[PDB]
Amino acid sequence: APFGTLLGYAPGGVAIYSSDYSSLDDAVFRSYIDDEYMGHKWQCVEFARRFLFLNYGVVFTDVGMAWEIFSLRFLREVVNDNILPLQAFPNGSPRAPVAGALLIWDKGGEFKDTGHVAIITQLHGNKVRIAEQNVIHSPLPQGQQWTRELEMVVENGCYTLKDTFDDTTILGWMIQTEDTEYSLPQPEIAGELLKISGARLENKGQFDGKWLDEKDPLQNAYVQANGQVINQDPYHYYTITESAEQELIKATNELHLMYLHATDKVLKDDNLLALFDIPKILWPRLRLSWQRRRHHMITGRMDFCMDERGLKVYEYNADSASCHTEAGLILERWAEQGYKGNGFNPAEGLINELAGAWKHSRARPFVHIMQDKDIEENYHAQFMEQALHQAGFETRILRGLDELGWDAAGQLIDGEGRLVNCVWKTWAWETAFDQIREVSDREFAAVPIRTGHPQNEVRLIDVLLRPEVLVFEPLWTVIPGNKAILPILWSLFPHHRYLLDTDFTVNDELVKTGYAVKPIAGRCGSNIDLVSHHEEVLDKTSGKFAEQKNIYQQLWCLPKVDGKYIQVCTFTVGGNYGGTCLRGDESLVIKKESDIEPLIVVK
Amino acid sequence: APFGTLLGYAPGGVAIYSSDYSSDAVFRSYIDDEYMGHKWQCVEFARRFLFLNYGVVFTDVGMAWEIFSLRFLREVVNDNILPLQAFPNGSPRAPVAGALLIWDKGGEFKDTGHVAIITQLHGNKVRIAEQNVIHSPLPQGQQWTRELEMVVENGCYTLKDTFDDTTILGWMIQTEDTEYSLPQPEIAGELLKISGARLENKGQFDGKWLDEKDPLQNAYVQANGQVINQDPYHYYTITESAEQELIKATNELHLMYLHATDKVLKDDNLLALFDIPKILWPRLRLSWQRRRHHMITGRMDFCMDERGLKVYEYNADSASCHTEAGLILERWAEQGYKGNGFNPAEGLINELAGAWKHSRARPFVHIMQDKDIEENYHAQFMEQALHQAGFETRILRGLDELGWDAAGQLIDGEGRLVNCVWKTWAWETAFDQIREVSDREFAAVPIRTGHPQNEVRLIDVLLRPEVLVFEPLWTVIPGNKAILPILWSLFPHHRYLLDTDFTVNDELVKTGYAVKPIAGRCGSNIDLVSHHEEVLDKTSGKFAEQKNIYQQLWCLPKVDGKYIQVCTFTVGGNYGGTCLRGDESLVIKKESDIEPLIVVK
Ligand SMILES: Nc1ncnc2c1ncn2[C@@H]1O[C@H](COP(=O)(O)OP(=O)(O)O)[C@@H](O)[C@H]1O
Ligand SMILES: Nc1ncnc2c1ncn2[C@@H]1O[C@H](COP(=O)(O)OP(=O)(O)O)[C@@H](O)[C@H]1O
Ligand SMILES: [Mg+2]
Ligand SMILES: [Mg+2]
Ligand SMILES: [Mg+2]
Ligand SMILES: [Mg+2]
């Protein structure tokens, strides 16, 4: 049948649609049940996630290809943002495949690159029935709630399934259970595949003059702030394998889920929330934000240490992150200007990824962009306006707060008298929180915002905390963006392969490993102390956050490659991977001024 | 200024509007799905202020003065219940910023009373914000409407109003600290006695007093004849104070019940006590999360007399009696009552229309009833409310008319797609169809999406993922008696709760108790046992094999020859009327009569 024709249903009344597109017949492809994303119409993964969500209220994280599901080790229980264990069993297992189980195909043969996923609906003595999308594209017999049956051989308590295809490879099945018996250990990637490698373009003088296009306003805003410069030596770049990017993608999606799970735990317990030093008057507002804008985050940036020892996350800049322009535009132009290879810039789709996120946000039609008066934020703010524009929103850029004012009744208006009720900001929420802390000893029954002023002087907090102004990033993002969340994540996922032991005191293990001291609300590599296991100060930075509470994180130094310490960063857009970029510095501490290093992912 | 004009803001950006009506669904004020109040009354501003600044809310109330009697606030994000204390004007407990300030009815605030929010406390005064006093723009950036003089003598705080004929009750603080606070008012028993009365017999009910021209009234007659009770010239009355109490209890108990529901759905150990097929558990949860605010109507059963008010159960899934209370008794009154009282259920049909208007029902609603003439008028009465709220409907009687197309889509007798249903069926009937199979290890609710002879079962409709069903699946939890011991556990000794347990514990042995199947209804399989350990009564029924709960004995009062039970309706979570049920026996049943009731001030 044509694309999206209803073919029948799997157990429980879960539809099965034809996913046959033809050359003869982009946001419309996103399949959602409420605010929960099921996948892409009407692929194998979309059916499997929807089946699991409609029948058991659970879902698995975003994956590029179906075969990757087999590498996952948990499922998110949607109604309470809970995390359940998911075990994997290889085909030919003592662990029989029960109804409800995920059945995964590695890539290969009939499922060439994608691999495949289906749901086991019923087990028999010598076969199982399964349901799936993207195999059967014709209507199923009336009332039949399975698409295919696969023969199952049961020898000596071992179970083996055989496909109806002759060139495919069945990885195995998956069960949501705490019972690890017979299960496969979580796949671990070979260190060597994570090594970052230096490389060099041929010098044909490609970066001699004005290589950035000064006709493009965005690029020129970038030059006004930085010159025709990305890194020290533009002829030099670094590369990472595709296996490595795949690993980056996987960790980004998983850690985003871990962080929102620890955010939920935080907001559910005053003792945990207290650890963040956020003004108590905001607490109920933080809870309400989390409840109603749960799915409204547009973008954030994770900072990682990646090399042969593995993948580790230092932090998640979820409130207000930048580098998007550098990764998604300047490096594109850099590649266009001088890269002649087969590889690619892992951040190439960032602008479109952002546009999609905005299309599916609940942002108002007109969005005011609030940036500070720093030429450096100009391009960041304009790069985002480009995504907003592409998604169909109207915008106006506010530089500083001077243009903002109030009518007689106190409504917030811009320099043109237009009402400001939706803003995307470059300002960190914490900056506004400082305005409440300044008058901490006053007895306000509410966030002390102004609804009027003789001189019409509008402060940041007078915009961001007006109840009817719809702000992005949402207020709750200050929680995953606050390093006080690291000890909590370590407590929730002790010894997780991507986490570093982090604590509020230098505990015993940190003593022996050496640690990094970081302010909980700092950024840009400010006020950071790196202390060795030999108890010597390896490095230290200055900055405005010296008075804040600090956390202590197990020392795990950036690798040094081709003379520079290299840090890997990934972007999240709507909660999922949206790209990777590199920061390189002569020291162990990346900072606001550290270079962005051209990165090419090679297959 | 004209109605709804912004006059400014109270602290934190909570707008204050003009409520000058001088200058019907449009008056409801909501923030998302949370109902704030009526535009733009004192109560609406107080509730919106507390919700926007602290994410908490207080229960619906008829007039502002009643807030002073409340002792809890609901925390919206986790449906948690926080303690709220009351302090009398002239208290050692100072009125802090954020506190609710309540006026009793009287003077400037004649019937309503009033409520404001205290924004700032000084040494000789307090500043407050409110909505139904000042209707003119406020001084630019001023986030308070009036200032009241505060007198402070010997550790005691006293506020004086700007009006000379008003009575300030006090202020309320969300705190566990009970020192200085007021005990929760309790009504005088005498005001709760139900009294009998008689109309003068001038033959008002001799013949056809019900209008058979009205299809609804005729559906009622086809099922019951021109009859309501054994003697139509007799009636009962309750005081307006008793009604205010029933209102208060209905709203509180509905929130307590939803609170226990949230707790149940958060803990498998509690959920398991309900004997609901495990396969539905994930669905119950999704339903509770997505259809939180979608319950249309329910009915609580109470014992009310000089000893006070006790709730037996809350028929939150499939409740009836709406036609009797809201139409037939109205006709009864119009036909034979000439007094000053009123039918407390008179506005039921309008209350339901509103609930529907703000539900998220789809454009076309299929009404599903069973083939029982008794259900015809209930279905039809509800259809009228749906019609009034602008919805298209079709009544399906039994399952015969339903079918499936070739792909397995559910359709009605005219090929129309069925995707929104209001049912008279109890969810339990459907759960039975799941229990019947129970052998196989199905991976999902075992619904059919096709059948050779096209035979559609109740579950094949209600548990179809894309059919939007009212009442929502989650209501089976407050409607299942296994929630009574949980309610007792959560609010131990609450004034309206009866000690309920899953075994006859020691305290129940001493009090006597009622044995009640957890998923029964209509008075079936009930056993009443006295403290003397004697069976005071037993009923038969189709539920003898279910788990039972044991509830502290508290027998209905007998007035004028019959045990009288008081019921109240909830519509959209709030009080929507009262009616009476009378029986020669201690156990009310489906056939027990509905007794005319008049509320008198
Ligand atoms: N545990 C750690 N071990 C080694 N270096 C660290 C560690 N944590 C942070 N760093 C270094 O410090 C920089 C700043 O820490 P980060 O967590 O990214 O905070 P921010 O960038 O917000 O200031 C990192 O980019 C990295 O170079
Ligand atoms: N604890 C109790 N003490 C005395 N009578 C009770 C008690 N519980 C129930 N009854 C009587 O039994 C009837 C049926 O119980 P109820 O809880 O309303 O269950 P249902 O109506 O669902 O069968 C009540 O209307 C009342 O007449
Ligand atoms: Mg960083
Ligand atoms: Mg940071
Ligand atoms: Mg009852
Ligand atoms: Mg009942």
Side-chain angles (χ1 to χ4, degrees):
Chain A
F3 182 80
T5 293
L6 166 64
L7 306 183
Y9 301 80
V14 176
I16 302 176
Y17 300 101
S18 163
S19 195
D20 182 24
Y21 319 100
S22 160
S23 223
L24 312 190
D25 64 75
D26 195 48
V28 195
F29 287 114
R30 291 198 185 189
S31 174
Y32 283 88
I33 291 297
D34 297 315
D35 297 342
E36 212 49 54
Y37 178 71
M38 301 290 91
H40 204 262
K41 313 180 169 171
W42 286 106
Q43 319 182 308
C44 56
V45 180
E46 192 280 338
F47 171 78
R49 183 131 56 215
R50 175 148 52 75
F51 187 87
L52 294 204
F53 177 64
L54 294 169
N55 289 139
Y56 321 125
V58 306
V59 296
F60 52 83
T61 210
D62 199 57
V63 295
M65 295 306 199
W67 62 270
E68 315 192 75
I69 298 173
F70 200 66
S71 296
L72 304 174
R73 288 283 182 288
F74 67 57
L75 299 166
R76 166 169 147 252
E77 186 175 357
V78 184
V79 304
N80 57 20
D81 256 317
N82 211 310
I83 304 304
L84 303 168
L86 178 68
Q87 316 303 158
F89 305 96
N91 192 4
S93 174
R95 173 51 71 221
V98 306
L102 278 162
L103 177 67
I104 320 301
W105 274 251
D106 193 347
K107 50 187 178 303
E110 191 69 10
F111 306 115
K112 245 138 290 202
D113 295 292
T114 66
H116 185 236
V117 63
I119 295 305
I120 295 178
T121 63
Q122 22 182 304
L123 166 60
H124 288 277
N126 45 60
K127 70 189 180 185
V128 298
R129 278 153 182 194
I130 61 167
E132 69 217 316
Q133 255 166 186
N134 209 60
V135 179
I136 297 325
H137 300 79
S138 34
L140 307 185
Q142 306 188 171
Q144 184 184 290
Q145 315 185 327
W146 47 270
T147 49
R148 287 191 293 148
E149 312 182 307
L150 319 172
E151 162 190 359
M152 180 186 65
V153 177
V154 174
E155 301 296 16
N156 313 88
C158 263
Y159 299 77
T160 306
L161 295 173
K162 192 216 163 276
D163 205 9
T164 63
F165 298 101
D166 76 5
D167 63 355
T168 54
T169 301
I170 289 174
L171 290 174
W173 38 100
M174 314 191 83
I175 312 181
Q176 197 286 285
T177 178
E178 282 172 49
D179 191 5
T180 48
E181 175 178 32
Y182 309 136
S183 70
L184 292 179
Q186 173 136 223
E188 176 170 345
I189 172 171
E192 253 298 323
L193 290 179
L194 297 193
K195 283 182 78 157
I196 296 172
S197 297
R200 288 209 168 70
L201 299 185
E202 292 206 294
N203 201 325
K204 269 289 300 173
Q206 312 83 305
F207 301 107
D208 278 356
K210 289 171 164 36
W211 58 276
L212 289 167
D213 193 354
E214 254 157 70
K215 301 317 186 191
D216 177 2
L218 246 174
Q219 274 174 76
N220 190 55
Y222 177 88
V223 173
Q224 292 301 309
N226 299 292
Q228 294 278 334
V229 187
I230 50 174
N231 65 342
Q232 307 170 137
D233 172 19
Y235 289 90
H236 175 98
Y237 64 111
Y238 295 82
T239 62
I240 60 170
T241 71
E242 224 174 55
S243 302
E245 195 206 3
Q246 233 77 276
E247 185 73 4
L248 290 164
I249 294 172
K250 174 176 168 49
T252 292
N253 296 162
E254 186 176 336
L255 280 154
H256 176 76
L257 253 235
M258 288 163 59
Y259 267 89
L260 302 222
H261 172 65
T263 293
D264 191 80
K265 290 302 193 221
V266 164
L267 292 179
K268 273 172 187 169
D269 181 352
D270 276 14
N271 299 157
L272 292 181
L273 183 47
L275 298 171
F276 289 68
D277 295 326
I278 288 161
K280 193 126 175 181
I281 192 66
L282 292 153
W283 297 4
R285 295 262 227 132
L286 283 181
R287 286 164 170 145
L288 285 177
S289 179
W290 178 233
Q291 177 192 72
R292 69 185 92 166
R293 325 245 352 251
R294 163 72 178 69
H295 296 280
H296 304 164
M297 173 186 187
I298 297 297
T299 184
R301 209 193 62 251
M302 294 184 182
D303 296 339
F304 294 102
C305 181
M306 181 181 94
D307 64 23
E308 61 150 19
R309 296 175 289 166
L311 186 54
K312 291 296 178 174
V313 59
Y314 296 137
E315 62 157 341
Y316 183 12
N317 295 283
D319 167 22
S320 66
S322 52
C323 296
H324 304 244
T325 308
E326 286 75 358
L329 171 63
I330 311 305
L331 286 182
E332 283 300 273
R333 178 48 171 216
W334 169 87
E336 156 172 47
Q337 230 44 42
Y339 182 65
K340 275 58 152 161
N342 301 150
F344 63 101
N345 170 12
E348 77 210 334
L350 197 56
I351 199 79
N352 296 167
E353 214 64 84
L354 287 172
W358 280 116
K359 282 176 172 77
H360 291 83
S361 71
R362 265 52 207 62
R364 260 78 109 145
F366 194 92
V367 178
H368 280 84
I369 292 167
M370 296 185 72
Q371 67 164 110
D372 193 5
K373 275 201 167 187
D374 289 323
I375 67 321
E376 18 183 313
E377 283 173 45
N378 287 14
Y379 61 86
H380 180 54
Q382 286 167 230
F383 176 83
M384 192 60 89
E385 178 177 70
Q386 186 159 319
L388 279 155
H389 278 179
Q390 179 172 320
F393 304 82
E394 292 173 52
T395 60
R396 170 174 186 93
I397 299 179
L398 310 185
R399 289 243 307 145
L401 305 160
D402 267 80
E403 143 163 28
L404 300 176
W406 289 284
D407 62 24
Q411 287 194 300
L412 192 60
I413 56 173
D414 72 5
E416 185 87 34
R418 161 150 216 152
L419 285 167
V420 168
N421 62 20
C422 188
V423 320
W424 173 76
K425 55 168 184 72
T426 65
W427 303 90
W429 271 109
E430 188 59 44
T431 301
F433 293 179
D434 279 347
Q435 302 188 313
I436 305 166
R437 278 174 302 220
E438 278 153 10
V439 309
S440 155
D441 56 26
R442 269 64 199 191
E443 273 315 322
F444 43 55
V447 176
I449 57 163
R450 308 201 300 227
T451 35
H453 185 277
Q455 282 72 260
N456 240 185
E457 176 183 302
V458 184
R459 298 158 306 150
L460 173 68
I461 186 153
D462 298 324
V463 186
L464 307 191
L465 285 177
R466 256 200 152 265
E468 92 284 4
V469 172
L470 180 70
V471 176
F472 290 92
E473 295 306 335
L475 184 59
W476 65 262
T477 65
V478 300
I479 293 300
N482 182 307
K483 297 185 187 76
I485 205 177
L486 293 170
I488 295 165
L489 271 169
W490 183 251
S491 181
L492 293 165
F493 307 99
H495 294 91
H496 189 280
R497 65 188 189 292
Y498 306 134
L499 298 186
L500 289 163
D501 175 357
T502 312
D503 206 343
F504 294 102
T505 48
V506 178
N507 72 247
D508 292 320
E509 288 81 291
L510 289 181
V511 187
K512 65 138 300 186
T513 47
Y515 51 80
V517 186
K518 326 200 272 182
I520 66 169
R523 52 186 139 81
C524 309
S526 298
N527 309 94
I528 306 285
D529 298 311
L530 296 194
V531 174
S532 73
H533 49 284
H534 287 128
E535 200 174 351
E536 70 166 355
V537 160
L538 287 176
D539 197 359
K540 173 162 317 187
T541 50
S542 56
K544 298 177 164 51
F545 314 104
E547 307 288 281
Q548 293 180 180
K549 178 191 292 197
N550 294 305
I551 41 79
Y552 302 79
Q553 187 176 237
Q554 175 192 347
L555 191 65
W556 191 286
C557 300
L558 284 168
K560 180 160 179 54
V561 183
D562 283 356
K564 281 182 81 183
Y565 290 97
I566 297 291
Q567 160 173 284
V568 176
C569 291
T570 56
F571 293 99
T572 57
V573 178
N576 305 300
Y577 179 85
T580 307
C581 67
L582 297 174
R583 298 306 291 293
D585 199 83
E586 292 68 37
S587 81
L588 288 165
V589 177
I590 298 292
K591 301 171 193 91
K592 190 243 182 297
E593 46 280 333
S594 295
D595 290 328
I596 278 279
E597 302 294 344
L599 173 64
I600 287 303
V601 170
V602 295
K603 197 175 196 83
Chain B
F3 179 78
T5 300
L6 174 64
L7 326 172
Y9 303 77
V14 185
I16 294 164
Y17 304 90
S18 151
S19 36
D20 170 52
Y21 299 100
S22 68
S23 69
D24 162 280
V26 233
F27 296 75
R28 287 199 184 186
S29 167
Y30 286 91
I31 286 300
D32 286 337
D33 302 324
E34 204 62 41
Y35 174 76
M36 296 295 91
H38 200 70
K39 299 174 187 181
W40 285 107
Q41 323 262 86
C42 45
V43 166
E44 189 284 338
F45 169 76
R47 187 175 290 115
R48 177 159 42 86
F49 181 99
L50 293 195
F51 172 70
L52 291 170
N53 290 135
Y54 321 123
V56 295
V57 88
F58 56 80
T59 199
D60 191 56
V61 299
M63 303 271 79
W65 69 262
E66 312 180 288
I67 301 163
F68 205 53
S69 304
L70 301 179
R71 292 287 188 289
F72 275 145
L73 288 167
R74 184 181 124 234
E75 196 176 357
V76 174
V77 301
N78 54 203
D79 264 343
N80 181 43
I81 293 303
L82 308 159
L84 179 68
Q85 320 293 352
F87 306 91
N89 191 10
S91 168
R93 182 55 76 209
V96 62
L100 279 157
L101 186 59
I102 321 301
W103 274 256
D104 187 359
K105 45 172 169 294
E108 190 61 17
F109 304 119
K110 276 181 186 61
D111 294 300
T112 65
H114 181 239
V115 56
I117 294 293
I118 281 176
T119 65
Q120 44 182 75
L121 179 62
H122 292 57
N124 72 136
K125 63 174 151 77
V126 299
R127 271 164 177 176
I128 67 186
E130 61 220 324
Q131 215 157 233
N132 207 174
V133 177
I134 307 309
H135 278 74
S136 59
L138 299 154
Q140 311 58 46
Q142 196 192 94
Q143 315 179 323
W144 50 265
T145 44
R146 290 186 292 141
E147 344 195 299
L148 313 182
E149 180 198 330
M150 178 178 84
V151 294
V152 193
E153 292 201 48
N154 283 98
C156 247
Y157 301 74
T158 301
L159 287 180
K160 311 197 173 188
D161 194 17
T162 57
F163 292 102
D164 68 11
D165 63 354
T166 56
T167 307
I168 289 170
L169 284 163
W171 47 87
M172 308 180 93
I173 303 179
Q174 194 281 289
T175 180
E176 301 197 350
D177 202 9
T178 49
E179 184 182 44
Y180 309 138
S181 71
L182 290 179
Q184 178 152 207
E186 44 202 355
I187 186 174
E190 181 60 31
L191 291 165
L192 297 185
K193 299 319 261 173
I194 300 158
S195 306
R198 177 160 302 264
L199 297 173
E200 169 165 298
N201 193 329
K202 174 176 180 307
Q204 307 80 309
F205 301 112
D206 284 346
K208 295 183 183 173
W209 58 276
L210 282 175
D211 182 357
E212 280 188 69
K213 239 44 170 187
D214 169 356
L216 246 63
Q217 283 179 60
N218 196 235
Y220 178 84
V221 175
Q222 298 313 306
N224 296 108
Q226 291 284 329
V227 180
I228 34 180
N229 68 9
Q230 265 265 65
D231 172 21
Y233 288 86
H234 178 285
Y235 65 110
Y236 294 94
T237 67
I238 60 163
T239 69
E240 235 179 53
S241 308
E243 200 210 359
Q244 297 184 4
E245 182 73 20
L246 291 161
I247 290 170
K248 181 170 190 205
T250 298
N251 300 164
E252 191 175 319
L253 284 159
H254 175 85
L255 295 178
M256 280 157 69
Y257 265 94
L258 291 216
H259 186 246
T261 292
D262 193 73
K263 288 283 173 277
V264 173
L265 298 185
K266 283 188 173 161
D267 179 1
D268 271 9
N269 292 334
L270 297 187
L271 183 49
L273 299 167
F274 298 61
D275 286 343
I276 293 172
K278 271 214 62 170
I279 186 73
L280 300 149
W281 292 10
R283 305 290 235 70
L284 288 192
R285 283 160 183 149
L286 290 172
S287 178
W288 177 232
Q289 159 161 282
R290 301 190 253 166
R291 320 275 319 280
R292 178 57 181 75
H293 299 288
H294 306 154
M295 179 185 188
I296 298 301
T297 191
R299 204 187 69 255
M300 321 184 149
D301 298 340
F302 296 91
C303 182
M304 185 182 83
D305 64 22
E306 71 175 75
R307 306 168 274 168
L309 187 54
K310 292 302 186 179
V311 66
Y312 297 134
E313 71 164 330
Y314 179 19
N315 295 292
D317 179 2
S318 62
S320 57
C321 289
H322 306 242
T323 304
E324 283 77 357
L327 175 68
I328 315 293
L329 280 180
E330 276 295 277
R331 181 42 186 271
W332 172 85
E334 142 177 55
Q335 191 65 207
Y337 183 65
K338 56 179 268 82
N340 304 320
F342 59 100
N343 176 7
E346 74 209 308
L348 191 48
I349 196 83
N350 289 342
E351 214 48 57
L352 294 162
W356 278 121
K357 288 163 171 183
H358 302 84
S359 67
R360 283 279 285 138
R362 255 96 88 153
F364 193 104
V365 178
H366 280 81
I367 294 171
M368 292 185 66
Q369 61 162 102
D370 197 350
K371 300 179 67 201
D372 284 308
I373 34 70
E374 300 124 318
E375 296 192 23
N376 292 7
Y377 61 86
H378 185 223
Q380 286 172 234
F381 173 84
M382 188 61 94
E383 170 169 64
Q384 189 175 307
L386 272 152
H387 278 179
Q388 172 172 165
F391 297 80
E392 281 198 69
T393 58
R394 170 177 169 91
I395 301 178
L396 308 185
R397 308 183 75 255
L399 296 188
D400 301 336
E401 130 168 30
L402 289 159
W404 291 283
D405 60 28
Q409 295 201 308
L410 194 53
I411 53 183
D412 67 1
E414 309 168 291
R416 185 195 292 269
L417 287 165
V418 174
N419 69 182
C420 192
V421 166
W422 173 76
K423 57 174 191 65
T424 61
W425 303 95
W427 277 105
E428 271 285 331
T429 300
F431 297 170
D432 277 337
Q433 306 185 310
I434 295 173
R435 302 179 208 297
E436 263 170 354
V437 182
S438 193
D439 279 315
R440 45 200 106 317
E441 308 291 300
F442 36 51
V445 178
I447 65 169
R448 260 130 64 164
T449 43
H451 182 276
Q453 285 106 208
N454 212 203
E455 184 196 297
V456 182
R457 300 162 305 163
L458 178 64
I459 49 164
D460 300 325
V461 189
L462 311 182
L463 282 182
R464 221 181 209 268
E466 62 310 298
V467 179
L468 182 71
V469 182
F470 297 82
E471 299 297 339
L473 178 62
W474 66 259
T475 65
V476 296
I477 298 292
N480 176 313
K481 305 193 177 64
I483 204 177
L484 293 168
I486 295 166
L487 267 176
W488 182 256
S489 183
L490 289 170
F491 306 97
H493 306 104
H494 183 288
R495 69 198 188 288
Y496 306 133
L497 294 190
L498 288 167
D499 184 350
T500 314
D501 205 332
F502 295 102
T503 54
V504 176
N505 59 52
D506 272 78
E507 232 303 77
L508 289 191
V509 153
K510 298 291 278 179
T511 58
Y513 48 86
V515 180
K516 317 200 285 184
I518 60 172
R521 58 209 312 289
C522 307
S524 305
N525 304 88
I526 303 291
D527 296 341
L528 298 192
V529 183
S530 70
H531 62 307
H532 287 306
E533 302 208 346
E534 299 193 13
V535 178
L536 298 193
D537 203 346
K538 280 180 179 184
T539 61
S540 57
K542 50 188 171 289
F543 318 100
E545 309 305 335
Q546 296 181 180
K547 182 187 304 202
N548 299 303
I549 42 69
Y550 298 85
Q551 174 175 254
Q552 173 185 3
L553 192 76
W554 194 280
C555 309
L556 287 175
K558 185 166 177 52
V559 190
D560 285 4
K562 306 176 89 180
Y563 296 93
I564 304 292
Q565 165 172 106
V566 172
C567 295
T568 57
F569 290 102
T570 47
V571 180
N574 304 315
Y575 175 83
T578 307
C579 64
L580 295 171
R581 297 302 292 294
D583 200 85
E584 309 318 314
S585 104
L586 280 163
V587 189
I588 303 298
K589 319 196 172 63
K590 203 198 99 59
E591 37 284 318
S592 295
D593 297 314
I594 192 79
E595 304 295 346
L597 172 81
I598 295 295
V599 172
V600 297
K601 43 192 167 76

